[PDB]
């Protein structure tokens, strides 16, 4: 039932390595049985029911069963489970390529769209047909046989290269050893949490909860330098080899399909449409940010020169890679009176979660309830049920996986586990999502205390979760967050705006010790500090966007050299010689290839919606909130991103709000 929850979450998280392998073979056999049956149909015998409906039914059945197999590699604490899950992902990704390139299927869906009366089927079904045919041409199914075979074998090679690229980074266990003196300025609650060695030193890993505090707060330059070198040389050997194969393969496939570059090939499926639009966007934004970057670099150099003189260090007259975050942190403290280590005392994780849940309850008309004795993949994971406040309809469930551990995905991500689409029997499947982050653990007898940047990350990822939960479509391939890549960051970045509002922040904060609120003056300073370091922080994202475009545009380019080029020309902070940042650039292998610009691209849309609608009429207005759910989240991928933006804004978007929020124009 749409108003119940029992039995609607069919996910199991107690699979052994052997069961993962057995289930993978069973899923492939049963799924191939459906594609074979459709392929055996006479071309003049195909109908909506025996062809379109049959393929739609197997897509939802397959994607849900696939989740139980390919998700544990990201979260399971058992390394053998993670390894079996990775092997299942490799095998199922090759199987996905085989089925996607069946000419008999492509021939029959093409014949269905040409013969059936499109006017008498739902618009999302017409979208299913045209997108399916478009995907077929993007797989070369309209091309001769031997070029299809060449594309297939290359796509199979690329799927394993991408999986290995991220597997290497996920299982890396690099660590460094530092003495207490070498960890100067770092607080005791951080130091007293590290493992000690036989020489009374401390082991520090390259995980974010270790790397970031060292780079932001450690006053020993050599300590920051050794960490930056290790962080930007993770998997240097093996992942450079992967890039040296993956990037030419992407180019050669795009050429066979008729595109000049891989960047052109992927841009066609995004709202930006073309690479020349991306270049003009990044290049014009870079020029507007140039004066801010110069002023910020000047101030940082003055900070470093004074500290070197005070601490008696050598001064090299430049901003090294291992200096940037450290002096950006000082800029925040000095110019805006923001001490992140003091401010986190007001963000205990339970208060932040409570206020985050209450924000969506009041704004989007939803109800949240934590499930007790939930079936989860790790003891620290919690499960929540989402209902529509007015009707009681059970929209979905989401898991919260908030703390780091061995073998867990290091970054911050949202995972779609069940699509909120229609089932073969006509009923609606309950959507399921998982929020996976690595927040500071409880230490020193205190609850987990989140820095404001961790609260913003929490809100960012929860925006993805609610997009997955609120989206309801007929077909699984349009469900949840299956929108354009340069559009999927709109709901995530939209929610971040609620951590930069005074009244909202007052509701999210409560001192862990005496329950007192953040002082009014400090709240005003926190909100006004939103643009601190924005020049170099944004220019760094432009560097990443430019490197991503270039590595998928020019063919015979050294990725490390191309990164170093844009670091000097755009950011003004040289890349450390000997490092290879692109070899750690997981986005290049995680579906963001040629599309990393999408973060900045999405921010223009989210800022326009927040300023023009929410801020103009109250950012807690439930009427504007419900309009946002129905027009932006609920359609999922069943509508074009620009169409949903136009429905919400009632006009075309522009950069006025985006530029105004950056202190530009």
């Amino acid at each position: 039932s749409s108003y119940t929850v029992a039995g609607r979450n069919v996910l199991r998280w107690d699979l052994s390595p052997e069961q993962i392998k057995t289930r993978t073979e069973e899923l492939i056999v049963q799924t191939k049985q459906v594609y074979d049956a459709v392929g055996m149909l006479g071309i003049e015998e195909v109908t909506y029911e025996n062809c379109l409906q049959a393929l739609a039914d197997v897509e939802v059945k397959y994607i849900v069963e696939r989740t139980m197999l390919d998700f544990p590699q990201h979260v399971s604490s058992d390394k053998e489970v993670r390894a079996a899950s990775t092997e299942a992902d490799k095998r199922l990704s090759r199987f996905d390529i085989e089925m996607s390139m069946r000419g008999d299927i492509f021939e029959r869906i093409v014949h269905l769209q040409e013969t059936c009366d499109l006017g008498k089927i739902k618009p999302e079904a017409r979208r299913y047909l045209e997108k399916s045919i478009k995907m077929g041409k993007r797989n070369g199914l309209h091309l001769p046989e031997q070029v299809q075979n060449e594309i297939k074998s290359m796509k199979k090679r690329m799927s394993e290269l991408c999986i290995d690229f991220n597997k290497n980074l996920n299982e890396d266990d690099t660590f460094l050893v530092f003495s207490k003196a070498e960890l100067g300025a770092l607080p005791d609650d951080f130091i007293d949490s590290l493992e000690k060695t036989d020489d009374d030193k401390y082991k520090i890993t390259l995980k974010y909860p270790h790397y970031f505090p060292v780079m932001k707060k450690c006053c020993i330059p050599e300590t920051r330098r050794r960490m930056e070198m290790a962080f930007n040389t993770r998997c240097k050997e093996e992942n450079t080899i992967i890039l040296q194969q993956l990037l030419p393969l992407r180019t050669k496939v795009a050429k066979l399909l008729g595109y000049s570059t891989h960047a052109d090939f992927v841009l066609e499926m995004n709202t930006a449409k073309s690479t020349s639009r991306v270049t003009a966007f990044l290049d014009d934004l870079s020029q507007k940010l140039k004066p801010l970057g110069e002023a910020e670099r000047e101030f940082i150099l003055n900070l470093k020169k004074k500290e070197c003189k005070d601490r008696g260090f050598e001064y090299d007259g430049k901003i090294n890679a291992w200096d940037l975050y450290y002096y950006m942190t000082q800029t925040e403290e000095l110019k805006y009176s923001i001490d992140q280590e003091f401010l986190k005392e007001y963000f205990p994780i339970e208060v932040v979660t409570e206020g985050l849940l209450n924000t969506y309850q009041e704004l989007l008309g939803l109800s949240f309830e934590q499930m007790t004795d939930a079936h989860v993949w790790n003891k620290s994971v919690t499960l929540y049920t989402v209902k529509d406040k007015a009707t009681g309809e059970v929209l979905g469930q989401f898991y919260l996986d908030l703390y780091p551990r061995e073998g867990k995905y290091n970054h911050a991500a949202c995972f779609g586990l069940q699509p909120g689409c229609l089932l073969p029997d006509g009923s609606r499947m309950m959507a399921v999502a998982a929020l996976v982050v690595n927040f500071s653990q409880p230490v020193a007898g205190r609850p987990s205390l989140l820095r404001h940047d961790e609260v913003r990350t929490y809100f960012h990822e929860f925006g993805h979760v609610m997009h997955q939960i609120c989206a309801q479509t007929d077909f699984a391939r349009f469900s949840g967050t299956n929108v354009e890549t340069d559009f999927v960051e709109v709901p995530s970045q939209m929610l971040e705006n609620w951590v930069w509002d005074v009244d909202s922040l007052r509701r999210l904060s409560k001192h862990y010790k005496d329950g007192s609120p953040i002082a009014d003056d400090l709240l005003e300073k926190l909100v006004a500090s939103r643009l601190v370091n924005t020049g170099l922080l944004t220019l760094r994202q432009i560097v990443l966007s430019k490197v991503d475009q270039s590595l998928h545009t020019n063919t015979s380019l050294d990725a490390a050299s191309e990164y170093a080029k844009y670091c000097s020309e755009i950011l003004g902070v040289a890349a450390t010689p000997g490092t290879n940042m692109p070899a750690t650039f997981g986005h290049l292998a995680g579906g963001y290839d040629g599309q990393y610009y999408g973060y900045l691209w999405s921010e223009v849309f989210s800022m326009d919606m927040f300023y023009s609608c929410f801020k103009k009429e109250g950012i807690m207005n439930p009427e504007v909130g419900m309009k946002y759910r129905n027009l932006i989240l609920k359609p999922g991928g069943s509508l074009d991103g620009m169409d949903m933006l136009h429905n919400f804004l009632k006009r075309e978007p522009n950069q006025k709000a985006f530029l105004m929020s950056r202190g530009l124009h």
Partner: peptide, 6 residues
């Protein structure tokens, strides 16, 4: 899956 900025 969906990722945050690097």
């Amino acid at each position: 899956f969906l990722r945050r900025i690097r």
